[PDB]
Amino acid sequence: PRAKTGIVRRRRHKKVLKRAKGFWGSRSKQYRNAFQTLLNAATYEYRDRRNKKRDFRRLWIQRINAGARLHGMNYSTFINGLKRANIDLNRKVLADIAAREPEAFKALVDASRNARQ
Amino acid sequence: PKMKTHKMAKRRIKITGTGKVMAFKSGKRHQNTGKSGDEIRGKGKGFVLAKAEWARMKLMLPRGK
Amino acid sequence: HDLKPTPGSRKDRKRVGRGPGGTDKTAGRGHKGQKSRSGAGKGAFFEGGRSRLIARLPKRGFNNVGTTYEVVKLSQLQDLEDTTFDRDTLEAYRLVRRKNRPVKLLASGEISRAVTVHVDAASAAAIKAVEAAGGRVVLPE
Amino acid sequence: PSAGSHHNDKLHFKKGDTVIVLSGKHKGQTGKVLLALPRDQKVVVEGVNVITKNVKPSMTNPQGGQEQRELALHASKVALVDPETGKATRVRKQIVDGKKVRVAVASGKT
Amino acid sequence: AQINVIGQNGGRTIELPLPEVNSGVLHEVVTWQLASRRRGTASTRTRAQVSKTGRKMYGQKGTGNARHGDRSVPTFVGGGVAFGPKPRSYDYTLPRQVRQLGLAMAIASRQEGGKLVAVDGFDIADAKTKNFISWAKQNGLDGTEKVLLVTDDENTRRAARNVSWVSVLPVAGVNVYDILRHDRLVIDAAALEIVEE
RNA sequence: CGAGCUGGAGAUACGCUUUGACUCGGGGAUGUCCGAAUGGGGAAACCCACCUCGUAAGAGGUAUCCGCAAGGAUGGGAACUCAGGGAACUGAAACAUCUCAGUACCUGAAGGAGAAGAAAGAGAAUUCGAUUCCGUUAGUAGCGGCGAGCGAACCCGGAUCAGCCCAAUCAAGCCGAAGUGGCUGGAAAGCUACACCUCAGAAGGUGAGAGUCCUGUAGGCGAACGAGAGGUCGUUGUUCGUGAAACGAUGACUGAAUCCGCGCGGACCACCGCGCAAGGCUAAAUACUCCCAGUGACCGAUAGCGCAUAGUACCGUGAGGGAAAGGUGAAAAGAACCCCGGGAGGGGAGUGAAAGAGAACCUGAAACCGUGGACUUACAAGCAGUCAUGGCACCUUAUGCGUGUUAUGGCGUGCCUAUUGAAGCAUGAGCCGGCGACUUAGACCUGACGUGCGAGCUUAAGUUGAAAAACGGAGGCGGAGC
RNA sequence: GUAGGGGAGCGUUCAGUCCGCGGAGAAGCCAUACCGGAAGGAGUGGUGGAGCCGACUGAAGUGCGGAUGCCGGCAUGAGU
Ligand SMILES: [Mg+2]
Ligand SMILES: [Mg+2]
Ligand SMILES: [Mg+2]
Ligand SMILES: [Mg+2]
Ligand SMILES: [Mg+2]
Ligand SMILES: [Mg+2]
Ligand SMILES: [Mg+2]
Ligand SMILES: [Mg+2]
Ligand SMILES: [Mg+2]
Ligand SMILES: [Mg+2]
Ligand SMILES: [Mg+2]
Ligand SMILES: [Mg+2]
Ligand SMILES: [Mg+2]
Ligand SMILES: [Mg+2]
Ligand SMILES: [Mg+2]
Ligand SMILES: [Mg+2]
Ligand SMILES: [Mg+2]
Ligand SMILES: [Mg+2]
Ligand SMILES: [Mg+2]
Ligand SMILES: [Mg+2]
Ligand SMILES: [Mg+2]
Ligand SMILES: [Mg+2]
Ligand SMILES: [Mg+2]
Ligand SMILES: [Mg+2]
Ligand SMILES: [Mg+2]
Ligand SMILES: [Mg+2]
Ligand SMILES: [Mg+2]
Ligand SMILES: [Mg+2]
Ligand SMILES: [Mg+2]
Ligand SMILES: [Mg+2]
Ligand SMILES: [Mg+2]
Ligand SMILES: [Mg+2]
Ligand SMILES: [Mg+2]
């Protein structure tokens, strides 16, 4: 008995083309370029998952550095005197405190400096 | 079809019990007046091959003879 | 439709090619080679270009057919056969069957109860140990 | 592939005979047989009805016009009648005379 | 060990295939049997066949086209099939031993069912079907099962034939299929204890 | 056969037929011209004749070979068979003996088959007993640049049987059981409540799925006509390649015995065995399959033959090559008629269940071209993505982990193949469909899983039955090595 | 993790068998934010008009982006 593709291929293909939208030109419309575009897209997804884990960390950091400096502290010195008084805060939170909660950041500062000297 | 026996081999190789294949030692027609004595004597005889080069021989004959 | 097949009694074949899953490309074959080629003949005794062990070796002797002798064992006329005797067709309708050959009886086991044999030939130690346990050996004329 | 093909091009009835529509819209109606086409297995009963337009055709008649006449049918919604009952009425074949062959029901004949 | 119906009442012989009947050997014998009877028939053409003459079509180099030789080729529309089926025959000889053991295991499987009806007689007038339906009705044959006759009397079969819910196997031609193929075995009885021995 | 018919062809008018048409079976009659062509010629289907009878119109004859005559031969046939002739590529990883293989092809003859056949035989048992066929012996004995590779037969089981003579019933057809009421529906065959048939539940048609409408099937009938010698030299055949070369087989030279004789037993000799050369026919089993029928874990429109038909269209001076082609509806009820236009085309109407079937008439994917709408885009640098956030939009697996779109950021060297190393300025490819490649065979080899019997395991050819399978010990594998 | 060997499976047809659906509508096609570890598979909505899903088992012409692949259609170059 013979068994044409009949259906399967159109199936596979559409799957890709439905992943494949928003894509500029041919990419969103022809299979090969679509599936392809998606190979690379794969690479970018994986890496950029861990990557965003980096990037956010960076962001939090610069916000804290700011905070410290807003009084007279370095990031490194603030964070270090916040290791010294053992104030074991996540730094994401520290950003949050720093930019949305003023006088709190103030206190955490005075603390870090105290524990530093 | 029926795998042919290699008549190339029906006077030069041997099966056994364990399955091992034997053959003879080589140098006995103009490798003579050499001699040496234990050579000429050594070479009339017979012997089991190594391994590696065994299975080939086997496949040369199905009946084992 | 009730039924089912014995676990491991039918293995699904290999369809090579088909995906990276999977056996990508090549089909087991690797990259290039004479092996790579849709073509018969190689074959199995073709070592190298070369000259083979196969033909490097002494052709000893020749090939005689000869009369080859059909085995009968002691421990088979013996133990629990309880002597129905050998007769002719009798041993045939038991456990020694060929045709177009002559039967031989030789040792292997031990001997007790008395039996007379009906073989085409036999070993010295056989007639010896079967007479010395109470029975003859009928060799043809 | 012909219609009488699987019906041994066989007309179970005849031109003249009254008929009753088994299956369809015209479930049960009476009609004399006006036209019985065996091969195509098609046939005309005075029942059916139809409104046909015979297009421009200047000769005859400049303008078109229409026509109430009736569409033929398939001898498989055609049914012979039983004078008594008059309905869903199979047929047996018997012999009156004298090498004249005929046709009864479960109570002959027609 | 099971009872008859219209004559005797014996049936206590017939030993059976335990541990507790096997599905494996069954399925084996079945699929085998199914195979053995296939028409071996799916033919297709190869290059040698597809009426598409040898002639080199065009230039081996030069054209600016891919290279081809013939139009009778696996990669061509029109051409021959590559690895197609040809006429063969999927039949082999399943070794005696397991034919017997299957057959048995089937009977059995339906005895401890218990969908056996060991039959010694048959009252089905002269070769009429309604008589079959009646007899049937009075042995326990509601009408909601598939039933497989094995007897030797032409009349009973001729009665058992048009029955939508019943099959009619004559004498010996009996098989793990038909039996497992069904709900009920019309045993019968005659060649059962004597086919035991 | 018994009511319709007047070919596909679907069109009018003409008609025919219950004195029996049409269709079917069975014979007959008529059958122009070409073609073995055959009265002579010829560029096939055309040209020109002569002779016999006729009133003409016509009819017959006029080839060649075997024959006394009567009579037979000529040409065609897909394969199947026999014969004269007889390749190469290939393989031996080069080639020449060799292998391909007496294969492809050419030719001759012949049939429904043919060939072969009634022992100077196999042979080794003082056994079989014409042939052809299958199983098996058996990849065994042997052949061979003893390399590649080539490869019997006797016995044993089956198929089918035969040994004779001469020279001193199917083919046309008929006949065949048993349901109605309500329900959905455009339409009943389906749903349903109660029914009956079955030797008939195989199938097909009927507005959608019918055992009980139709045609049929199980069954029963069924026709006037109808069919049932030796030797030498050069060589070769079988497993036979000059090898110890037997034997047959013939080209050229030689050409013995006929019974107290002849031929073989693989050089050759005796012995001892099997045999009757120089004359012929022979059914049966076997091979094929243009054609007919039945079936199918065969195809359904790129499949399947090349063809849903066509060796046509088309190409070719020729030999030769050689396509794609399918679908309105249940039924033509095929769209009278009004509207814009010369038309084409469309918009109504009207039919239908549906015109979301309208004749470019089943579904109607994708590339590809457009209209509208959302959000966006004219200081911007780009493998076109990713990931984060803001904007705007939307709310039928959907108001949150949302969906569409977007701005800004970070980040980021198409895919495949080929490679020491690919974004590579290295190969491939315009795009999307669909077709497209690790298979089959052998009762071979060797392994892993499994199974059934287990010092035991097993059949093959065949036989019988066959909506199934059983029989079949002939041989095979294990049994002891050297 | 490349060549490679091993392990478990997803989908396609044909087939045996059972569950069973379908003109109050089958397959096929179209949309989507659901499910599964993945091959994949469900819900509903629109299409269509007469056939088909599911489980178990068997057999394969059984899964395509490439072959300057084959057939066909439609793009670029170009209103040149
Ligand atoms: Mg980190
Ligand atoms: Mg694998
Ligand atoms: Mg490659
Ligand atoms: Mg390499
Ligand atoms: Mg190009
Ligand atoms: Mg008629
Ligand atoms: Mg005339
Ligand atoms: Mg002429
Ligand atoms: Mg050559
Ligand atoms: Mg070569
Ligand atoms: Mg001829
Ligand atoms: Mg000679
Ligand atoms: Mg020769
Ligand atoms: Mg000779
Ligand atoms: Mg199509
Ligand atoms: Mg085609
Ligand atoms: Mg118009
Ligand atoms: Mg727009
Ligand atoms: Mg600027
Ligand atoms: Mg701007
Ligand atoms: Mg690839
Ligand atoms: Mg390089
Ligand atoms: Mg570039
Ligand atoms: Mg490139
Ligand atoms: Mg290159
Ligand atoms: Mg095993
Ligand atoms: Mg199925
Ligand atoms: Mg389908
Ligand atoms: Mg492509
Ligand atoms: Mg290029
Ligand atoms: Mg311009
Ligand atoms: Mg330009
Ligand atoms: Mg210009």
From Swiss-Prot, chain B:
Coiled-coil portions: none
GO terms under biological process: translation
Keywords for the protein's UniProt record, in alphabetical order: Ribonucleoprotein, Ribosomal protein, RNA-binding, rRNA-binding
GO molecular function annotations of the record: rRNA binding; structural constituent of ribosome
Subunit structure, interactors included: Part of the 50S ribosomal subunit. Contacts proteins L15 and L33.
UniProt xrefs under NCBIfam families: rpmI_bact (TIGR00001)
Entry similarity comment: Belongs to the bacterial ribosomal protein bL35 family.
Function field: Binds the 23S rRNA.
Protein name per UniProt: Large ribosomal subunit protein bL35
Curated annotation (Swiss-Prot), chain C:
Gene Ontology CC annotations of this record: cytosolic large ribosomal subunit
Keyword Cell division: no
GO biological process: translation
Keyword line: Ribonucleoprotein, Ribosomal protein, RNA-binding, rRNA-binding
InterPro entries: Ribosomal_uL15, Ribosomal_uL15/eL18, Ribosomal_uL15/eL18_sf, Ribosomal_uL15_bac-type, Ribosomal_uL15_CS
Region Disordered: start-end pairs: 1-45
Record keyword Nucleotidyltransferase present: no
Superkingdom of origin organism: Bacteria
Gene Ontology molecular function terms on file: rRNA binding; structural constituent of ribosome
Oligomer status and interactors: Part of the 50S ribosomal subunit. Contacts proteins L4, L21 and L35.
Family from the record: Belongs to the universal ribosomal protein uL15 family.
Functional description taken from the UniProt entry: Binds to the 23S rRNA.
Name this polypeptide is given: Large ribosomal subunit protein uL15
Gene (UniProt): rplO
Swiss-Prot record, chain D:
NCBIfam families linked: rplX_bact
Record Gene3D superfamilies: 2.30.30.30
Physiological role: One of two assembly initiator proteins, it binds directly to the 5'-end of the 23S rRNA, where it nucleates assembly of the 50S subunit.
Upper lineage: Bacteria, Thermotogati, Deinococcota, Deinococci, Deinococcales
Name recorded for this polypeptide: Large ribosomal subunit protein uL24
Organism: Deinococcus radiodurans (strain ATCC 13939 / DSM 20539 / JCM 16871 / CCUG 27074 / LMG 4051 / NBRC 15346 / NCIMB 9279 / VKM B-1422 / R1)
Quaternary data: Part of the 50S ribosomal subunit. Contacts trigger factor when it is bound to the ribosome.
Cross-referenced PROSITE patterns: RIBOSOMAL_L24
CDD domains attached to this UniProt entry: KOW_RPL26 (cd06089)
GO biological process: translation
Similarity field: Belongs to the universal ribosomal protein uL24 family.
UniProtKB/Swiss-Prot annotation, chain E:
Top-level lineage group: Bacteria
Keywords assigned: Ribonucleoprotein, Ribosomal protein, RNA-binding, rRNA-binding
Transmembrane segments: none
GO biological process, one term: translation
Any one Gene Ontology molecular-function term assigned to this protein's record: rRNA binding
Pfam families: Ribosomal_L4 (PF00573)
CC terms in the record's Gene Ontology section: ribonucleoprotein complex; ribosome
Subunit structure, as described in the record: Part of the 50S ribosomal subunit. Contacts proteins L15 and L34.
NCBIfam families: rplD_bact (TIGR03953)
Family membership: Belongs to the universal ribosomal protein uL4 family.
Known function: One of the primary rRNA binding proteins, this protein initially binds near the 5'-end of the 23S rRNA. It is important during the early stages of 50S assembly.
Name of the protein: Large ribosomal subunit protein uL4
Origin species: Deinococcus radiodurans (strain ATCC 13939 / DSM 20539 / JCM 16871 / CCUG 27074 / LMG 4051 / NBRC 15346 / NCIMB 9279 / VKM B-1422 / R1)
Gene: rplD
